[PDB]
Design a protein around this ligand. Structure first.
Ligand SMILES: [Ca+2]
Ligand SMILES: [Ca+2]
Lengths: 926, 926
């Protein structure tokens, strides 16, 4: 079980004896290691003393020690009250103790290729700001270096750091690590597509990679994990009708009885009752689907119980780790096999205690949601891929299956590069540590082999696999390597390209003899599924092999012309705003032999820098829906606001917000009332969307109102009463942006106001409280209807303009305009009315006169129901009169008499201008 | 225009000169009344002096003289701030003045058939309780009598008095008027069917009459209003194709210019532009429907129409008073006339100046929603019917069209009887005022002609028209009359009856000659439309005419056998809980001549007294719906409670209520924080329905949960924490009841607790804030889980029984049972847990162990989003662990870090037993 083939490298450079490896994480509780045994004490840090002395010569104070292997374990971001289990048995169990064996099924460790090296475990977590988490991290790596690690494995715990802007103490640490030839290695990420695992990016928005690691943290290598076409797995033997044994892969939760002969009974999907017809003593065989695992396992235990065998309902699916439901032993198996047992004559099986490396149902596979990413300048983010168990966990959370068993992929590559760099210390004695680190990185990427997606008959995108799957055997034997034209990077980025472009790479031959090679370039784009990217590769073509010879101790450039014009029409119909044209320039000794070297390249057929950064306003949605917001069918322009209880996860789209303030609160303020919190009325101040209005006869909903031209009726009355006084920008950003600023322009076109600027905008790549919500409200963009250093603007129509710039180099500034009406005209309403006691009808002396059309004209009254205030509203009759009830009924059956003094006439216009008048006032003499 | 034919009675008894007519009402502002004139000041009261003298002799210190007509006026309920105009113009415009002429199309007014009588106007209104209202009313009639009334018209303004229990004072007042031969007449009401004009009564609940006037009133006569087959009306004329003039009825709002030819154009229903294309300068002819009148008119005016003619979409509809929209002339016409105009080649019309008596489109008609009513003992409520303009108003309110122009019907009858009683002063010299009144009532009702409903080929139900339509001519000329078997009443009620029964009535011959007549009985029931009563009659059959001779000056009993067994099968299929068998015993001097006398009778084929008084609990609705509540298709079990803001008109059905109290408040109370609306949490105490629960992963709705037996999962944890501590009865009563009481029985059938009694229950005859809600919450029935001695009852299952008794005589007590489990077992939960800083999961050591099944098992935390606390909940993963986030994001894109001290483990079972433990507590070094 050696996928990356490190054997030859170890034979050549060793296994890390006398070396030190640093591992920085949020925690190491899940040791994975059997609390990692020990070794063969033959080099450095052989005792507390050994540590202390060095640790003191280097000016280090907080150093610890845990035994051999783990020669260090200081805890940064310490203060915060920690209580693992029993605290190592209460003070290390009276000093000297602590251990936990077992490492079954796990093929790789926290060293991969350097198992005989000591570890420096530095725990670092976010406690009191990223800025301080960053400084700890920087110190955490400077100490590793001063402690002599040469190899550092970094993980940022529970992410949420995507696009974070940390202090320069961080980048400073990285530069220093680079200067000393120390490698910093991190993981590429398993949830890297815009929208998250529960969604797919839209085909017209190709900028969908989400980089989890902050730019400042430029690690030596970012590595993606993948599942090889074969893996070390537990198994279960079965006898087929033809009378023969068939050993199959299985993932089990809870342990079965080693070597038995369990009987098994099919139960469909366990969604019905007759499904577990028996199961009496039979293991429940169930197909995945319709309902969740927890239930399948529970229903199985109800009946016969014993154990269960759930089989995937997807062909090339990853093995799923079942939940532990009442110690119930549950194992997961591929679909193929599942369908095999469902027909096997002898419904009997045996669980082998011998893990065996067998083919995988998935075959060579990278999760469709993993690694996707581009750097600010156009380079693909991931550098290389490495093997991992890659199992989908059904218990990471209750929202989606989280990819698991990938944490050991980056460390594997780290170990391999440490050994290769070591190999170079003897192979190229004159090189400095930095130079050896650079060479090792270039060779590792060049020699890495491009993974193939059999399922799509295409290579996995370099945006996912980087330069390819690490191959230690090739790296160690490598006497040549390929870089881009600049001779600095091991990846090529072309930025914007037309249908015809050239890819030029440089082959560096370090051997004393010329080398003959064959080269080709593969060309591919993205696969689309309707209006969404499928997150799968789409091969276009590959060039036919060309021969070239590189003279001894020299380098030669290779240029491969590419022409994908014949695919333009079809591809544009699927991805109208452009698409990627990417691939690999591959080299071989002979076209029939295996890939010797490969370097990835990527171009964008369009103008990537200028792709739209903001999702259009929901007002513009012909459907009423948006990427993160579902519309209400059977409700044209319904667009409720925050309501009485806001849900951060709802209404996440581009729009303008404003506030609704009921006349009751407005009046309470104009009077005195300090409290207002317990006023005898049921309405509250609410945040709503501009352009939306409640119905005359409220129905608890707000609706978008539009002008004859289709634009939303946005209007404010900046008169300080809090009712629709301002508009504020809320946006769903599809791409990162900078310098977001709002400005207001009058009819002429003059800028009368400019907001403060929001330096950085982070795209809304998900809609989750733990990472980022689907939209963001920008308070600095709020416009209260006033001009630059001045007063309220004059009534009229204005242009509320939101400006923002994509971060891509040279990107043009983008903007979205909203027409906003300003109007502070108080409504003119009747000064008198008459009331018919026989008719209970109030007749106003005249209709309301407002500058903006009438929004609502009602008669309000409030009555108590069990100390619970309730404000009722009366709409006008067809002739403009209002009928006033003589009473209101309580839910308990009590009659509440109503008098003229209980009623208040309220008129509100579209801009929120409002006037309220006691009906007694209208009736009195004049 | 004398539909009641009062001509012959007047030219034999006069027109009320020298008499006094009293009118008690809530107002008179609408009272047109041709006041001022009297053309013979030789009335009972000449000048203020004669009046002031009269009231001085009867201890009346209040009241004032006005006009030679209206010799007395007074407001028995001043104080409370009630303003009219400007005091007639600052003290009756200089003291002693006035004028407000404006009456047309009306052949009737106050005083009725006694235009020469003086008036006594008593203004009474509900002001500070119905008790004060009652006294004020009793006093008003007392003053009326002493001032020499003889006739008293009573109007209770805007009721909401249905089934009100007024003081024994009011009754004494009536008994006094009765003893003085003073008749008190009142209207039968135009909205008398269960559920209101907006609904229809259900066919399986035949007790659907709603009596608006309090029982402790009992007028001399309760008058129903009806539209005759011809009415005085303004008209319009058109030239038909035969070249002749066609004059048709019209009801106009605002005014068209008389004798001026107007062109008109058809606009369909005016529900779509282009409809008004050829309308400019013409009258828009528009059909009723789809949109409201106001909009059809506004659209017409915008299109340049000079007025509109709206025609009915109903064939026998009442004319409709159109709304005044910007003074637009608007006239309403029948369907037939509208179709005639639409199809007329010469589209020119002229509005005539002189009104005219013309056939009505409705024909003889009683509103389908009017009069329905029975008294407690089973008598039909209405006594007689009288003509009115009966016009539907589209501006009375904004929910339904209100029948108008019925106010003069009762006063008309009052005047007729006043005259008949005067007539009896001469003939029948020794009778006493009391005996004259009783004879007048008998003759008036016997003489009344049973109205025929041509549309249904059946007589209108006696429950609507009483003894028939008043006919002063037959009344005045009558020398005979029929009464029930006794001589007490002029109405017959048989209570419960089988298919075969007989009706016996007494004919009284006051003549000196033998009288030969023919008689028969009509038999009818209710017309049904699917699941509802159509509020229309269903004729069954009429008996063959039989002969009888009544000797001079004597009485003779007449019996008519009724056999409707032939119809039971069908009728029972439509009205399964029984149906009425009613009709009239009619008398003629010749089967081919007109009706001379008729007396109504009514029986109920079934057991009326024991009809179900309470709608079954919503839990039992297969649909999820009830009479006043529509279920949610797609979720029959959804049953939300009051929520964040209760709606008096929603969720009105029979059920049990309880309360939900979040742990945050339970904790805040258990600790001691005064003022609960300050706590840093978003949830609040909510009223919900027992048997309902939120989902583990809250979706903002509550759902009914049921035991396997199908009963709602009603459970309480009587431990004083406010969370599901009690159950309270909420009922939608279909019939009035008395002595409502709740009791709880243990498994043994023993009563362990009894609630206070709720003496009277008024049926929920509507779902309207101004009259009655669709259900009533009975707080006295609240059970907090304690027994008769304040001791919390033991955990177990109990029967929450609600008992109540219909008001019908002999009715058995009915009851509804609800199974309620009581369980105060505190949940037992893990006391320790381990948290993985790596996986981010919190693993609990054990449990949860609860007595009742688990309701919700969650981890909560609250963060701020702009000084707005928001409590978030995390559900467990499929293996029982919980994943805890590191941060929460604000809507403004800010990061709110989360630490262990922020999380709380909360366990709640089905009875509301709950436990909450800080996650830090569970971690507390174990
Ligand atoms: Ca305002
Ligand atoms: Ca409780």
């Amino acid at each position: 079980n050696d996928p990356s083939q490190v054997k030859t490298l170890q034979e050549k450079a060793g296994k890390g004896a006398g070396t030190v490896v640093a591992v920085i994480d949020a925690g190491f509780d899940k040791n994975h290691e059997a609390w990692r045994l020990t070794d063969k004490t033959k080099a450095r840090y052989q005792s507390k003393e050994d540590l202390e002395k060095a640790k003191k010569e280097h000016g280090i104070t907080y150093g610890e020690w845990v035994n051999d292997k783990v020669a260090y374990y200081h805890d940064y971001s310490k203060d915060g009250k920690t209580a693992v289990d029993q605290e190592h048995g209460t003070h290390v169990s009276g000093i000297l103790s602590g251990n936990a064996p077992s490492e079954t099924k796990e093929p790789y460790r926290l060293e991969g290729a350097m198992p005989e090296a000591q570890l420096l475990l530095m725990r670092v977590e976010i406690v009191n700001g990223l800025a301080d988490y960053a400084r700890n991290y920087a110190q955490a790596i400077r100490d590793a270096i001063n402690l002599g690690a040469k190899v550092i494995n970094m993980s940022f715990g529970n992410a949420a750091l995507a696009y974070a802007n940390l202090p320069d103490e961080t980048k400073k640490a990285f530069d220093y690590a680079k200067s000393k030839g120390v490698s910093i290695v991190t993981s590429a990420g398993n949830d890297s597509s815009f929208g998250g695992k529960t969604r797919l990016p839209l085909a017209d928005h190709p900028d969908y990679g989400v980089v989890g690691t902050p730019a400042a943290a430029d690690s030596t290598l970012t590595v993606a994990s993948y599942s090889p076409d074969k893996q070390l797995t537990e198994t279960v033997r079965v006898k087929t009708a033809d009378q023969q044994d068939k050993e199959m892969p299985v993932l089990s939760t809870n342990r079965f009885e080693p070597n038995k002969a369990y009987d098994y009974a099919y139960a469909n999907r366990g969604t019905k009752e007759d499904d577990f017809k028996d199961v009496k003593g039979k293991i429940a065989l169930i197909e995945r689907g319709d309902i969740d695992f927890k239930d399948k396992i529970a229903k199985a235990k109800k009946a016969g119980a014993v154990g269960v065998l759930i089989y995937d309902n997807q062909d090339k699916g990853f093995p799923i780790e079942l939940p532990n439901v009442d110690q119930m032993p549950a194992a997961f198996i591929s679909r193929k096999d599942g369908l095999l047992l469902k027909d096997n004559p002898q419904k009997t099986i045996t669980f082998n205690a011998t893990p065996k490396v067998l083919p995988t149902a998935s075959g060579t596979k990278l999760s469709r949601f993993s690694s996707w990413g581009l750097t600010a300048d156009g380079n693909i983010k991931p550098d290389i891929a490495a093997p991992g168990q890659d199992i989908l966990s059904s218990v990471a959370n209750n929202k989606y299956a989280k990819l698991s068993g990938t944490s050991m992929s980056a460390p594997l590559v780290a170990g391999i590069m440490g050994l290769l760099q070591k190999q170079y210390e003897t192979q190229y004695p004159d090189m400095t540590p930095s130079e050896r680190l650079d060479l090792a990185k270039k060779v590792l990427m060049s020699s890495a082999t491009a993974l193939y997606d059999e399922d799509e008959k295409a290579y996995f995108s370099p945006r996912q696999q980087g330069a390819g799957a690490v191959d230690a055997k090739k790296a160690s034997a490598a006497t040549m390597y390929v870089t881009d034209k600049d001779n600095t990077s091991s990846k090529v980025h072309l930025n914007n390209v037309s249908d015809k472009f050239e890819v030029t790479v440089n082959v560096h031959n370090k051997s004393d003899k010329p080398q003959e090679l064959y080269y080709q370039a593969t060309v591919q784009t993205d696969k689309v599924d309707g209006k969404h990217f499928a997150l799968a590769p789409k091969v276009l073509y590959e060039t036919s092999w060309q021969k070239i010879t590189i003279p001894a101790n020299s380098s030669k450039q290779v240029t491969v012309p590419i022409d994908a014009s014949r695919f333009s029409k079809d591809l544009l119909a699927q991805m109208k705003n452009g698409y990627f044209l990417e691939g690999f320039v591959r080299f071989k000794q002979d076209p029939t032999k295996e890939e010797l070297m490969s370097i990835p390249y990527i171009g964008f057929r369009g103008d990537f820098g200028n792709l739209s950064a903001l999702e259009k306003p929901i007002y513009d949605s012909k459907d009423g829906s948006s990427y993160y917001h579902e519309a209400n069918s059977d409700a044209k322009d319904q667009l409720d606001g925050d309501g009485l209880q806001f849900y951060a996860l709802k209404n996440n789209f581009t729009a303008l917000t404003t506030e609704s303030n009921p006349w009751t609160i407005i009046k309470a303020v104009k009077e005195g009332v300090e409290n207002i919190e317990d006023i005898e009325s049921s309405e509250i101040t609410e945040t709503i969307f501009a352009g939306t209005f409640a119905k005359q006869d409220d129905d608890s909903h707000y609706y978008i109102h539009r002008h004859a031209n289709g634009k939303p009726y946005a209007a404010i009355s900046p008169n300080g009463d809090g009712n629709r006084d301002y508009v504020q920008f809320q946006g769903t950003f599809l791409r990162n942006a900078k310098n977001l600023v709002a400005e207001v322009l009058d009819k002429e076109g003059n800028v009368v106001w400019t907001s403060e600027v929001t330096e950085q905008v982070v795209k809304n790549y998900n809609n989750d409280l733990a990472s980022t919500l689907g939209s963001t409200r920008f308070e600095k963009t709020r416009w209260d209807g006033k001009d630059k250093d001045g007063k309220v603007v004059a009534n009229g129509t204005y242009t509320y303009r939101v400006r923002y710039t994509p971060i891509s180099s040279g990107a043009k500034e983008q903007h979205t305009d909203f027409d906003v009406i300003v109007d502070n005209t108080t409504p003119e309403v009747a000064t008198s009315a008459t009331f018919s006691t026989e008719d209970r009808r109030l007749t106003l002396a005249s209709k309301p006169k407002t500058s903006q059309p009438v929004y609502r004209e009602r008669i309000a009254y409030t009555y108590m129901d069990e100390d619970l205030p309730t404000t009722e509203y009366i709409s006008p009759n067809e002739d403009g009169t209002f009928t006033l009830p003589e009473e209101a009924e309580t839910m308990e059956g009590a009659t509440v008499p109503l008098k003229m003094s209980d009623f208040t006439y309220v008129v509100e216009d579209m801009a929120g201008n409002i006037t309220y008048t006691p009906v007694t006032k209208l009736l009195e003499g004049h």
